[PDB]
Amino acid sequence: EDAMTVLTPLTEKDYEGLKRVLRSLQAHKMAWPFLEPVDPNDAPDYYGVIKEPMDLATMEERVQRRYYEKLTEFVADMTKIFDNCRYYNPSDSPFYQCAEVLESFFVQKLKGFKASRSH
Ligand SMILES: CN(C)Cc1ccc(Nc2cnn(C)c(=O)c2Cl)cc1
């Protein structure tokens, strides 16, 4: 990551952009598996295997509470959603395919956020 992503403290202005990115993911048709935590009853060994679960509702709470100090930390939580999904599910699973498309969408939006940070 570039040095601004790693080092520049997030401001309130930055948080308006992070909220916009999060809302765009939550509205995407293929974000349906990631809106809320994985239900253990739908995946019985999931919480024994996935040591750091993440989901978009948890990220929404963290954004509201100003949990993130650096953009890197916000990107790391987002990336957990996708990496956990691809770690647990086979490549032909609908969940895995959602992670592939939604991560590409996140990267597009993230690049937009980084470009606008200076202006
Ligand atoms: C209440 N429920 C049915 C909604 C729901 C919430 C999350 C998900 N997402 C899941 C599920 N299982 N697994 C192995 C995953 O990796 C992912 Cl992302 C699906 C439905």
Side-chain angles (χ1 to χ4, degrees):
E1 296 166 328
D2 61 277
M4 179 160 202
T5 292
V6 178
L7 298 177
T8 301
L10 291 167
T11 61
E12 285 294 303
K13 189 177 178 283
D14 284 325
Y15 265 91
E16 182 275 340
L18 294 185
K19 190 187 184 189
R20 263 199 280 101
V21 170
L22 177 65
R23 286 282 189 264
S24 285
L25 266 69
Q26 294 169 309
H28 193 288
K29 190 158 100 163
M30 294 315 267
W32 70 267
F34 309 124
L35 302 177
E36 299 292 335
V38 170
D39 188 333
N41 299 322
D42 287 346
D45 58 324
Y46 190 88
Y47 286 91
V49 170
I50 296 299
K51 288 302 127 83
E52 286 185 292
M54 194 38 64
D55 64 281
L56 294 169
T58 300
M59 290 194 72
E60 179 173 346
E61 171 180 1
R62 289 179 171 188
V63 167
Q64 180 57 251
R65 285 274 263 141
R66 306 305 194 237
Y67 168 90
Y68 306 99
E69 291 176 0
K70 300 292 177 353
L71 181 58
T72 191
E73 316 161 347
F74 173 88
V75 175
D77 268 1
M78 196 55 68
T79 300
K80 288 186 185 73
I81 297 176
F82 310 128
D83 286 354
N84 289 344
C85 184
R86 290 188 297 248
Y87 185 96
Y88 184 88
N89 294 287
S91 70
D92 67 340
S93 167
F95 302 128
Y96 193 114
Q97 279 156 156
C98 288
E100 294 282 69
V101 60
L102 196 67
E103 187 164 28
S104 83
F105 181 76
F106 172 63
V107 164
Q108 288 171 328
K109 290 290 185 173
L110 178 63
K111 293 169 174 312
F113 173 83
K114 293 181 180 179
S116 292
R117 211 160 173 207
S118 57
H119 61 89

